[PDB]
Amino acid sequence: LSAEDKKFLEVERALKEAALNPLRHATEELFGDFLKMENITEICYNGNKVVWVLKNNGEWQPFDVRDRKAFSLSRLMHFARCCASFKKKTIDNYENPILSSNLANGERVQIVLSPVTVNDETISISIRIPSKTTYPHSFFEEQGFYNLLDNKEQAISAIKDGIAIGKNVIVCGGTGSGKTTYIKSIMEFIPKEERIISIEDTEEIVFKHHKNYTQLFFGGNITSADCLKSCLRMRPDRIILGELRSSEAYDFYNVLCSGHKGTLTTLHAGSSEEAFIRLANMSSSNSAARNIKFESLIEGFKDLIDMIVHINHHKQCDEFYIK
Amino acid sequence: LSAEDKKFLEVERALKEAALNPLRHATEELFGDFLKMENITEICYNGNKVVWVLKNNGEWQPFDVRDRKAFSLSRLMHFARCCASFKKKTIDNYENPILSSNLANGERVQIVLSPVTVNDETISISIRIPSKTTYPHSFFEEQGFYNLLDNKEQAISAIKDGIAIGKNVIVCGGTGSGKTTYIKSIMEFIPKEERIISIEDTEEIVFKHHKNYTQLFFGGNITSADCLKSCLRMRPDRIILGELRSSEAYDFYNVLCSGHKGTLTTLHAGSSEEAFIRLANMSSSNSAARNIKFESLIEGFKDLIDMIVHINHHKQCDEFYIK
Amino acid sequence: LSAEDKKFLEVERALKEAALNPLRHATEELFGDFLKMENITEICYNGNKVVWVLKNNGEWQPFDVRDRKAFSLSRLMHFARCCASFKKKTIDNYENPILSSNLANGERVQIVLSPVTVNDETISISIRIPSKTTYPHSFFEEQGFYNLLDNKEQAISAIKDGIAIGKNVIVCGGTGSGKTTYIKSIMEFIPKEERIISIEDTEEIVFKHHKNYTQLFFGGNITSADCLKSCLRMRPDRIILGELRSSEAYDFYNVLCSGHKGTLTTLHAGSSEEAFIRLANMSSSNSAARNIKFESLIEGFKDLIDMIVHINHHKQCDEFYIK
Amino acid sequence: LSAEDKKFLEVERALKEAALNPLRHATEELFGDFLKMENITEICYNGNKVVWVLKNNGEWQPFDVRDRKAFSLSRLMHFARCCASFKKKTIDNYENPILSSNLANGERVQIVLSPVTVNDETISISIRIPSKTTYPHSFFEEQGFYNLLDNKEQAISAIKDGIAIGKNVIVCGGTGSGKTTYIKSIMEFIPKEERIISIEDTEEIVFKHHKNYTQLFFGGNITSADCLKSCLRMRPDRIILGELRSSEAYDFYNVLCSGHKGTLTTLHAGSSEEAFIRLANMSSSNSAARNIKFESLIEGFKDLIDMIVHINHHKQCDEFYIK
Amino acid sequence: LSAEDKKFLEVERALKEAALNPLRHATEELFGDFLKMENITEICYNGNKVVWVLKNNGEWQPFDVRDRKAFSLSRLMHFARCCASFKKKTIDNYENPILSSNLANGERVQIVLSPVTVNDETISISIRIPSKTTYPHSFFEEQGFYNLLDNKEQAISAIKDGIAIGKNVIVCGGTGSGKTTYIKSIMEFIPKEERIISIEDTEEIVFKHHKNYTQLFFGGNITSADCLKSCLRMRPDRIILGELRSSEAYDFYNVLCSGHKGTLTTLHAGSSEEAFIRLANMSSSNSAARNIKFESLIEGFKDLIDMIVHINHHKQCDEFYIK
Amino acid sequence: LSAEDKKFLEVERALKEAALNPLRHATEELFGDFLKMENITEICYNGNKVVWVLKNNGEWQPFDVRDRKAFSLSRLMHFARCCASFKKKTIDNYENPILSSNLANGERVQIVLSPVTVNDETISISIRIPSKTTYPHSFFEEQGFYNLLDNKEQAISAIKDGIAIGKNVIVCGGTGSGKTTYIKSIMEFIPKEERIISIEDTEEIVFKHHKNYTQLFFGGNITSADCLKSCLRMRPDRIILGELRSSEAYDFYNVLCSGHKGTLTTLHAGSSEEAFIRLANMSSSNSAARNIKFESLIEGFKDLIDMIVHINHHKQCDEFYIK
């Protein structure tokens, strides 16, 4: 079939692989070395001939690029447009100076040009490194992910059993607190017979223990609400939400109202109590929740969310909400 | 008359059976074997050369299709387009990657293409088997559909008598908990003299004990609200709502406000208390309920819904709400 | 004048009588026999070669039409279009499968075609028989319309005197509970010197005891709100509302706020308490009531409605609300 | 100046007196006799060869016109169109069957044509006689306008003094309760030095005791809100509102909020308490009051309206609200 | 520079001075004599050959103009159009019968034509005389502006000191209660070093004691909200609002929320308590205050407004609100 | 690279330096001398041949320019247009008399022309001097910035430690109270390893102690909400908001809800308590907060804002809110 399938794809690939090849070389030429460094969480460039790299250990390391052709306005701009076209977008110095796109491999890329930047020789770039690895849950314990908890044993058992029985779990914290990583590891506890549908922004979750599943990705005209709506039409046993933004916000509250099996998602929030308000706020912004009391949404999630895990800047659990 | 009627239909049938014949062969060529398997509730394909079939016993069974022409991008895409055109829709890799359509027989079909799927060799397909069969209510008892209830005898009598007297009943639970099946069986108790109008999404309910009736189907530009609106203009004794979504939501609250005879419908909800909120939420989203207090809607259904039956993942009643 | 008036009308009549003659024959050809049967409340056809007729005694009687040219897709469709054009509408298998129109004499007609019906050989038709007769109020007593009441004498006097003094009365119940019939009879008690304006959907009320009056009919672009608005500009002593739908809903609350003489209308509602909420709900849907508290509307009608009469499925009063 | 002014007006008058002369003859030809009858409050025609005339004594008197050319469809329609064009409007059997216009002298006219009327030989007409006369206030007392009050002397003094000091008074009751008449008479008490601006729908108020004043009339594109807005820019001492409808409703609440001198207007309402709600309801419908608590409006008028006079169907005061 | 500046202005002046010269002569020809009369607050013409002039002493004086060419429809109309064009507007007998414009010197002018007036020989005109004089504050005391107060000394000191320290003061009352005049006089107490920006409708305030300042005028497409928005970008020490209308209403509440130095403005209101509600009402009408509780606005101004001065029809303070 | 980068920029620079060179000379010709004066906070021109300059010591100093070509309508207008085009805007005497732009160096400029100004020889100009200097925090103490506090030592330690630990701080006060200056100095306490993103209106903050950072500027079509949205996608450790206006208002409440590290921004407000309401008001105006209770927002910031510093007109802290 590979022979018949190749000719069939031939036309779309040429199309895609015409904006993707260019982008790969730009990517290679500029951030190549950087993308190969182990244990890094973000590659920033501040349009000042210096590349700042953030390590998993929360340290910022700078690198001198004053002497590289790759970091020339012409070279940087070409890279920028390559990202734009790749995601069917435009970046310029007028109506589109700020950009959000991805690399060939899918890593989030945020580019900012003049006039939004201080001057015309400034081109801000921020690459988000998904930290491609799937550490086992045991590894989290061995490293004391739960050491700050007073209910350590309880928490470690609740996460194992809870998830195994299909409770709705929410993992929250700040950008880069290892939220995704954590959920990826705790998935070892979903019975391998479960069908799982994952809705993400960029491929990140890996299915090491499950065969039956499907991954959905929102982006462009396809909102996350579309993927979660499709999801509910694909007979899922577990639904894994890459991250609650605002669109799905309310359509997630509903999925929960209909008493749905095992949900699991990440959210930016400083705490448990916060997570509930974060949810209400978000859900409220939806036109469908235009006639529902605000406190009524908060109490809504309060009944539906079985357990919340918060993670601090030190990639350690500092609160384990239950029941 | 059949002779005159044939020539009369001739032109629409040619039109329809021009998108339906193509679709039948595609359907036959790919999921034929699968659609013939007994006691299955869903046929999923995850674009990975393996067909996953869900059995009534809640088990997932996979099937190797690596060696079939039918499962080639070209073969799969043709099938996909066949579903699209059949329901007057389009499926593509741009503005219409997600699709909701039906088979020749009416079974719900959910197709997802790239870019929404992980890659371009992935084509997600989910067929919903309306488990074709009409088991007698007695069969439900023999199998202990009510065994978890503490008010078993009470419940089994309430459902028989209640329905016979025209109470408004709501059957709820998760996808595939046998809600439809249950309502089809409990219909044995509606006096055969009753005129029944059924509003569904796909033909599913069967009228084994009733002669005078009519089936309405919403889809496309015809919303369910249109069918329920027409319904109230067709002198019905009993109204059977395939499933409360959101459109009818409020227009259902009203049908109840006007003190209407015997209503009976299914709804996704984890419990009794939940069902009332599920209802309010939904009704609220309607512009007509823009000036009605939210708690006022909840109390609204609370007075109008005489009895609620909830079903767990094990296709067993685990709560029988009454009065 | 009849001579000059004839030539004057000549042009509109030809126009109307060009869609009305066709419709009369279709009507005659199909439901002729049926429309001549005494004491029937609805003529239904379920696209199955059988005509179901509902008798005043709540019984459904079926009739075999397998052997009639009139009931051929071609014959049924022609009838359907005749109804459509008659009311300046279209009925088809695409954007207009559901239809609401009337017969030459004005009886409500609801037609449903494929795709909304189960198949293409199904054409649903529901004719509503106004039950053309004006029984005296005494006849209602002789038949025990009030026998279920504990306050029988009280109720029978309240309706007589109340109406005679101009109180606002609301008659409610389900479709075909003899609401219209009832109001028609209790009109014997409005002083014959009263000027009455009636706003209906189809001519039904008869003025046996009153000379000075005028009938308004809404339909098409003319909403009932338009007729009630005109009404208040025609110096009426009594206003008879065919039936509260939703448009007039709020503009009716107002007519009452301005302390208006004798109002009398029908409404679908299961009870007294219900009728008040039914009213609030409806009024609320109006943009003019966008800034008025929902409970404030309920209390609104509670002060204004002097007496409510409810009728059960057995065409008997089972609640007589007063003061 | 009359010579120069004539040539100046010549062009508009020709324009106006081209639709007004035709209308005068029609008016003369049909309702001539009727318009000359003394003490009548409304001339109704129900499209049945009979003209119904309402006398000031609340009696309905009918007149046989079967034998008059004037009452022929052709003759009636010409009259109808004459009213339409006169007010720059259209009346027809399609998009404009209902009409609201005026006669040459300004009397309100309500015409209804088929399809809104029962048949095509029916043409409903309702003329409102502004009972042309300005009876002295003393005459009201002599006739016992206040005889039903327990606080007779109090009330009669309050109305005299109150109005003389500039209190905000509201006269309310049903159509034809002599509200306008009453206000016209109580104007004898406004110091003759007061500048008065009157906002009406049709000229009706007469200034027997005042020289400095101006009359504003709303109609067509000029809403009453425009006339009250202009009013507040014409240095008025007293403002007389023909009748509170809904536009001015809120813009009237404001005029009062700014603590304005002497206001006086009529409103349809059954009582005092009702009048306040009638006001709130109306004010609320204005976009400017979109963010104001409903009960807050009621309390608003409650502080601002110093005294309310209600009149029953018998043209007698049956409630005199004060302070 | 005057030489270079003249040529530069030459083109705009010709443009303006082409609609302004015509208007001056019309103004001169008609209301000349009248505009020269001392101590008058308004010049009204009621289209009846009589000019009514209001004196500062609250007296209305009429003047016979039957024998003047100036008061001929042709002469009056020309004047009317002159005002219209001057402010870039149109006045006619159709879509623009009501007019608001100004004279060459800026005095407010309100013109009303037929159909809004009673007949075609009626042309209503109302000129508002700013009363061009700047009496000292002491003069107010000598005349007993504060004599009705029980806290006389207190009030007279509070106004002096308060204003000197930059408190937010609101002067309110009815049209022509000498509000503007009052504020103009109390400005003697703002330290001469203060920079003041004044936002008015027409030039009226005079800066007798201040050198550093700027005057803003709203009108036409430039709303007062625009001038107050610009104001906050011109480093003002004191802001003087000609008069709170509704646009600035909320944008004024905000200026106060940001704890702004010395504000001072006039508002139409009957009292202190009223002034706060007047403010809330107005602010609420702004889209920006769409999500803020109504009582929350009232309490808003209650904290921010340090002192309110009300003036009665007798140009005397009858309430001095403080703290 | 400078060689390749030059040719690359060549085309945009020519474009920009074509509106910027003209503007520099105008700026030089008129306000040159003035812009060179030390310790000044605003340069105002009131279209009266006198330039008013505000000194840091709160004193207003005027300067005679009657004898300068630069201050001639032609000379002033050319300057004005130069500012307009520079920011891609238009300034005229019709639809764009008010202008907000910047100088070559970025200083805020507010220009007002006739008709908005009193006459045609008036051209209002207000330049805001960003007092260019970065005084050390110690300098603030030496000058008694905290001397009015009863909790002096506490406050001075709280600001040092608080900021060092990443608390959310809000600095508020009136225009020119040295808010920006203060925040610039207290930045010495953010660990030099912290990545900082600053969102301003004009470049003002200076990074004396930090290497890794990026500056974002909103203006034109790029709102501040866009820069804060981009900000959260650039892995910041600290976010410095030039000033809360209204757009970011709610999108700032959210950034805080997600428990974000170290925020620090300025806001116009008279006090602590005020600052919370100022925040709520602003956030509410956002469509996303349309369904959130107003008091719920106030309580929102109350939990999230760790410490608020208010500054009086005398550039001294007069309230130090904490916890």
PDB file of all heavy atoms in Angstrom, chain E residues 41-61:
ATOM      1  N   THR E  41     -31.592  86.611  30.619  1.00  0.00           N
ATOM      2  CA  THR E  41     -31.052  85.260  30.648  1.00  0.00           C
ATOM      3  C   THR E  41     -31.498  84.381  29.475  1.00  0.00           C
ATOM      4  O   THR E  41     -30.991  83.285  29.284  1.00  0.00           O
ATOM      5  CB  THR E  41     -31.421  84.599  31.997  1.00  0.00           C
ATOM      6  OG1 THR E  41     -30.755  83.347  32.135  1.00  0.00           O
ATOM      7  CG2 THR E  41     -32.905  84.371  32.082  1.00  0.00           C
ATOM      8  N   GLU E  42     -32.428  84.869  28.668  1.00  0.00           N
ATOM      9  CA  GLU E  42     -32.925  84.083  27.543  1.00  0.00           C
ATOM     10  C   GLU E  42     -33.832  84.937  26.670  1.00  0.00           C
ATOM     11  O   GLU E  42     -34.644  85.715  27.176  1.00  0.00           O
ATOM     12  CB  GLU E  42     -33.730  82.884  28.063  1.00  0.00           C
ATOM     13  CG  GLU E  42     -34.147  81.842  27.015  1.00  0.00           C
ATOM     14  CD  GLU E  42     -33.172  80.658  26.927  1.00  0.00           C
ATOM     15  OE1 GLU E  42     -32.456  80.416  27.922  1.00  0.00           O
ATOM     16  OE2 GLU E  42     -33.137  79.957  25.879  1.00  0.00           O
ATOM     17  N   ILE E  43     -33.681  84.782  25.358  1.00  0.00           N
ATOM     18  CA  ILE E  43     -34.491  85.498  24.374  1.00  0.00           C
ATOM     19  C   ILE E  43     -35.296  84.439  23.630  1.00  0.00           C
ATOM     20  O   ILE E  43     -34.746  83.646  22.867  1.00  0.00           O
ATOM     21  CB  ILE E  43     -33.620  86.266  23.323  1.00  0.00           C
ATOM     22  CG1 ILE E  43     -32.861  87.429  23.979  1.00  0.00           C
ATOM     23  CG2 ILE E  43     -34.512  86.804  22.197  1.00  0.00           C
ATOM     24  CD1 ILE E  43     -31.931  88.174  23.038  1.00  0.00           C
ATOM     25  N   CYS E  44     -36.597  84.412  23.866  1.00  0.00           N
ATOM     26  CA  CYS E  44     -37.443  83.436  23.205  1.00  0.00           C
ATOM     27  C   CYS E  44     -38.352  84.066  22.171  1.00  0.00           C
ATOM     28  O   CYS E  44     -38.767  85.217  22.291  1.00  0.00           O
ATOM     29  CB  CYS E  44     -38.298  82.673  24.223  1.00  0.00           C
ATOM     30  SG  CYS E  44     -37.355  81.544  25.222  1.00  0.00           S
ATOM     31  N   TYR E  45     -38.622  83.312  21.122  1.00  0.00           N
ATOM     32  CA  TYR E  45     -39.542  83.759  20.103  1.00  0.00           C
ATOM     33  C   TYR E  45     -40.429  82.547  19.885  1.00  0.00           C
ATOM     34  O   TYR E  45     -39.942  81.426  19.685  1.00  0.00           O
ATOM     35  CB  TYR E  45     -38.837  84.152  18.823  1.00  0.00           C
ATOM     36  CG  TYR E  45     -39.832  84.656  17.821  1.00  0.00           C
ATOM     37  CD1 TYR E  45     -40.600  85.793  18.079  1.00  0.00           C
ATOM     38  CD2 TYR E  45     -40.056  83.968  16.635  1.00  0.00           C
ATOM     39  CE1 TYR E  45     -41.573  86.228  17.174  1.00  0.00           C
ATOM     40  CE2 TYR E  45     -41.033  84.392  15.714  1.00  0.00           C
ATOM     41  CZ  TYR E  45     -41.788  85.522  15.991  1.00  0.00           C
ATOM     42  OH  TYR E  45     -42.755  85.937  15.099  1.00  0.00           O
ATOM     43  N   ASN E  46     -41.736  82.768  19.952  1.00  0.00           N
ATOM     44  CA  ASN E  46     -42.681  81.673  19.842  1.00  0.00           C
ATOM     45  C   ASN E  46     -43.495  81.656  18.549  1.00  0.00           C
ATOM     46  O   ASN E  46     -44.612  81.135  18.498  1.00  0.00           O
ATOM     47  CB  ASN E  46     -43.551  81.705  21.096  1.00  0.00           C
ATOM     48  CG  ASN E  46     -42.698  81.745  22.385  1.00  0.00           C
ATOM     49  OD1 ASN E  46     -43.195  82.018  23.483  1.00  0.00           O
ATOM     50  ND2 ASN E  46     -41.405  81.459  22.243  1.00  0.00           N
ATOM     51  N   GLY E  47     -42.892  82.212  17.499  1.00  0.00           N
ATOM     52  CA  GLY E  47     -43.509  82.254  16.185  1.00  0.00           C
ATOM     53  C   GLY E  47     -44.851  82.940  16.159  1.00  0.00           C
ATOM     54  O   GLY E  47     -45.703  82.626  15.322  1.00  0.00           O
ATOM     55  N   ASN E  48     -45.030  83.899  17.058  1.00  0.00           N
ATOM     56  CA  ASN E  48     -46.292  84.599  17.141  1.00  0.00           C
ATOM     57  C   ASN E  48     -46.160  86.129  17.099  1.00  0.00           C
ATOM     58  O   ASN E  48     -46.978  86.833  17.682  1.00  0.00           O
ATOM     59  CB  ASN E  48     -47.006  84.133  18.419  1.00  0.00           C
ATOM     60  CG  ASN E  48     -48.476  84.540  18.468  1.00  0.00           C
ATOM     61  OD1 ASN E  48     -49.149  84.641  17.423  1.00  0.00           O
ATOM     62  ND2 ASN E  48     -48.993  84.754  19.686  1.00  0.00           N
ATOM     63  N   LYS E  49     -45.143  86.640  16.402  1.00  0.00           N
ATOM     64  CA  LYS E  49     -44.920  88.087  16.282  1.00  0.00           C
ATOM     65  C   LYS E  49     -44.595  88.775  17.612  1.00  0.00           C
ATOM     66  O   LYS E  49     -44.716  90.001  17.742  1.00  0.00           O
ATOM     67  CB  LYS E  49     -46.151  88.749  15.674  1.00  0.00           C
ATOM     68  CG  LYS E  49     -46.516  88.238  14.298  1.00  0.00           C
ATOM     69  CD  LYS E  49     -45.527  88.713  13.218  1.00  0.00           C
ATOM     70  CE  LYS E  49     -46.001  88.320  11.813  1.00  0.00           C
ATOM     71  NZ  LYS E  49     -45.086  88.782  10.722  1.00  0.00           N
ATOM     72  N   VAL E  50     -44.189  87.983  18.599  1.00  0.00           N
ATOM     73  CA  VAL E  50     -43.848  88.505  19.915  1.00  0.00           C
ATOM     74  C   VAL E  50     -42.573  87.859  20.439  1.00  0.00           C
ATOM     75  O   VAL E  50     -42.443  86.629  20.458  1.00  0.00           O
ATOM     76  CB  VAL E  50     -44.988  88.240  20.956  1.00  0.00           C
ATOM     77  CG1 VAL E  50     -44.530  88.653  22.363  1.00  0.00           C
ATOM     78  CG2 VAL E  50     -46.271  88.989  20.558  1.00  0.00           C
ATOM     79  N   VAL E  51     -41.641  88.701  20.871  1.00  0.00           N
ATOM     80  CA  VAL E  51     -40.379  88.243  21.435  1.00  0.00           C
ATOM     81  C   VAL E  51     -40.453  88.342  22.966  1.00  0.00           C
ATOM     82  O   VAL E  51     -40.687  89.417  23.530  1.00  0.00           O
ATOM     83  CB  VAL E  51     -39.211  89.086  20.901  1.00  0.00           C
ATOM     84  CG1 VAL E  51     -37.883  88.647  21.523  1.00  0.00           C
ATOM     85  CG2 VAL E  51     -39.157  88.942  19.410  1.00  0.00           C
ATOM     86  N   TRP E  52     -40.278  87.197  23.628  1.00  0.00           N
ATOM     87  CA  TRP E  52     -40.322  87.128  25.080  1.00  0.00           C
ATOM     88  C   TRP E  52     -38.923  87.114  25.634  1.00  0.00           C
ATOM     89  O   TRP E  52     -38.126  86.265  25.279  1.00  0.00           O
ATOM     90  CB  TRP E  52     -41.057  85.871  25.533  1.00  0.00           C
ATOM     91  CG  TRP E  52     -42.492  85.868  25.140  1.00  0.00           C
ATOM     92  CD1 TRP E  52     -43.009  85.416  23.963  1.00  0.00           C
ATOM     93  CD2 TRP E  52     -43.611  86.332  25.926  1.00  0.00           C
ATOM     94  NE1 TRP E  52     -44.380  85.560  23.970  1.00  0.00           N
ATOM     95  CE2 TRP E  52     -44.776  86.115  25.159  1.00  0.00           C
ATOM     96  CE3 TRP E  52     -43.737  86.905  27.198  1.00  0.00           C
ATOM     97  CZ2 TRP E  52     -46.058  86.442  25.618  1.00  0.00           C
ATOM     98  CZ3 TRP E  52     -45.013  87.232  27.658  1.00  0.00           C
ATOM     99  CH2 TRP E  52     -46.159  86.995  26.864  1.00  0.00           C
ATOM    100  N   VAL E  53     -38.632  88.044  26.523  1.00  0.00           N
ATOM    101  CA  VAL E  53     -37.309  88.131  27.101  1.00  0.00           C
ATOM    102  C   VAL E  53     -37.337  87.903  28.607  1.00  0.00           C
ATOM    103  O   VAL E  53     -38.119  88.548  29.322  1.00  0.00           O
ATOM    104  CB  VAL E  53     -36.685  89.522  26.793  1.00  0.00           C
ATOM    105  CG1 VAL E  53     -35.309  89.649  27.421  1.00  0.00           C
ATOM    106  CG2 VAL E  53     -36.594  89.719  25.290  1.00  0.00           C
ATOM    107  N   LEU E  54     -36.484  86.985  29.079  1.00  0.00           N
ATOM    108  CA  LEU E  54     -36.404  86.684  30.508  1.00  0.00           C
ATOM    109  C   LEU E  54     -35.285  87.472  31.174  1.00  0.00           C
ATOM    110  O   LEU E  54     -34.116  87.446  30.762  1.00  0.00           O
ATOM    111  CB  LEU E  54     -36.203  85.187  30.770  1.00  0.00           C
ATOM    112  CG  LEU E  54     -36.135  84.716  32.233  1.00  0.00           C
ATOM    113  CD1 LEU E  54     -37.159  85.395  33.112  1.00  0.00           C
ATOM    114  CD2 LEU E  54     -36.365  83.255  32.245  1.00  0.00           C
ATOM    115  N   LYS E  55     -35.672  88.170  32.229  1.00  0.00           N
ATOM    116  CA  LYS E  55     -34.760  88.995  32.971  1.00  0.00           C
ATOM    117  C   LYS E  55     -34.154  88.211  34.110  1.00  0.00           C
ATOM    118  O   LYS E  55     -34.725  87.230  34.576  1.00  0.00           O
ATOM    119  CB  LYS E  55     -35.517  90.208  33.490  1.00  0.00           C
ATOM    120  CG  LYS E  55     -36.175  91.002  32.382  1.00  0.00           C
ATOM    121  CD  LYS E  55     -37.179  92.001  32.925  1.00  0.00           C
ATOM    122  CE  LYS E  55     -36.616  93.424  32.972  1.00  0.00           C
ATOM    123  NZ  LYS E  55     -37.676  94.448  33.328  1.00  0.00           N
ATOM    124  N   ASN E  56     -32.982  88.654  34.547  1.00  0.00           N
ATOM    125  CA  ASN E  56     -32.284  88.013  35.637  1.00  0.00           C
ATOM    126  C   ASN E  56     -33.143  87.923  36.885  1.00  0.00           C
ATOM    127  O   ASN E  56     -32.955  87.030  37.720  1.00  0.00           O
ATOM    128  CB  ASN E  56     -31.010  88.774  35.937  1.00  0.00           C
ATOM    129  CG  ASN E  56     -29.929  88.482  34.936  1.00  0.00           C
ATOM    130  OD1 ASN E  56     -29.861  87.378  34.394  1.00  0.00           O
ATOM    131  ND2 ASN E  56     -29.058  89.463  34.693  1.00  0.00           N
ATOM    132  N   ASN E  57     -34.088  88.850  37.001  1.00  0.00           N
ATOM    133  CA  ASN E  57     -35.006  88.881  38.134  1.00  0.00           C
ATOM    134  C   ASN E  57     -36.187  87.900  37.959  1.00  0.00           C
ATOM    135  O   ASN E  57     -37.235  88.069  38.576  1.00  0.00           O
ATOM    136  CB  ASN E  57     -35.538  90.297  38.314  1.00  0.00           C
ATOM    137  CG  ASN E  57     -36.542  90.682  37.248  1.00  0.00           C
ATOM    138  OD1 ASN E  57     -36.559  90.129  36.130  1.00  0.00           O
ATOM    139  ND2 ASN E  57     -37.385  91.647  37.579  1.00  0.00           N
ATOM    140  N   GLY E  58     -36.014  86.890  37.105  1.00  0.00           N
ATOM    141  CA  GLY E  58     -37.054  85.890  36.881  1.00  0.00           C
ATOM    142  C   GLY E  58     -38.353  86.352  36.240  1.00  0.00           C
ATOM    143  O   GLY E  58     -39.349  85.625  36.246  1.00  0.00           O
ATOM    144  N   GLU E  59     -38.343  87.553  35.679  1.00  0.00           N
ATOM    145  CA  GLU E  59     -39.527  88.121  35.040  1.00  0.00           C
ATOM    146  C   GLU E  59     -39.520  87.932  33.522  1.00  0.00           C
ATOM    147  O   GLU E  59     -38.475  88.040  32.892  1.00  0.00           O
ATOM    148  CB  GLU E  59     -39.612  89.622  35.346  1.00  0.00           C
ATOM    149  CG  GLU E  59     -40.721  90.333  34.581  1.00  0.00           C
ATOM    150  CD  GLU E  59     -40.571  91.851  34.557  1.00  0.00           C
ATOM    151  OE1 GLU E  59     -40.396  92.450  35.639  1.00  0.00           O
ATOM    152  OE2 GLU E  59     -40.645  92.442  33.452  1.00  0.00           O
ATOM    153  N   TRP E  60     -40.685  87.652  32.942  1.00  0.00           N
ATOM    154  CA  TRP E  60     -40.806  87.485  31.489  1.00  0.00           C
ATOM    155  C   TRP E  60     -41.390  88.770  30.909  1.00  0.00           C
ATOM    156  O   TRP E  60     -42.460  89.205  31.338  1.00  0.00           O
ATOM    157  CB  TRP E  60     -41.745  86.326  31.120  1.00  0.00           C
ATOM    158  CG  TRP E  60     -41.132  84.931  31.179  1.00  0.00           C
ATOM    159  CD1 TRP E  60     -41.343  83.973  32.145  1.00  0.00           C
ATOM    160  CD2 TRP E  60     -40.199  84.353  30.245  1.00  0.00           C
ATOM    161  NE1 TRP E  60     -40.602  82.850  31.866  1.00  0.00           N
ATOM    162  CE2 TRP E  60     -39.888  83.052  30.713  1.00  0.00           C
ATOM    163  CE3 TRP E  60     -39.591  84.810  29.064  1.00  0.00           C
ATOM    164  CZ2 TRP E  60     -38.995  82.208  30.043  1.00  0.00           C
ATOM    165  CZ3 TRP E  60     -38.694  83.962  28.396  1.00  0.00           C
ATOM    166  CH2 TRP E  60     -38.409  82.680  28.894  1.00  0.00           C
ATOM    167  N   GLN E  61     -40.695  89.375  29.947  1.00  0.00           N
ATOM    168  CA  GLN E  61     -41.163  90.601  29.321  1.00  0.00           C
ATOM    169  C   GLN E  61     -41.383  90.349  27.841  1.00  0.00           C
ATOM    170  O   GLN E  61     -40.498  89.844  27.158  1.00  0.00           O
ATOM    171  CB  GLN E  61     -40.135  91.709  29.518  1.00  0.00           C
ATOM    172  CG  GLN E  61     -40.526  92.741  30.542  1.00  0.00           C
ATOM    173  CD  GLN E  61     -39.687  93.997  30.421  1.00  0.00           C
ATOM    174  OE1 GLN E  61     -38.505  94.007  30.771  1.00  0.00           O
ATOM    175  NE2 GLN E  61     -40.292  95.065  29.908  1.00  0.00           N
TER     176      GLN E  61
END
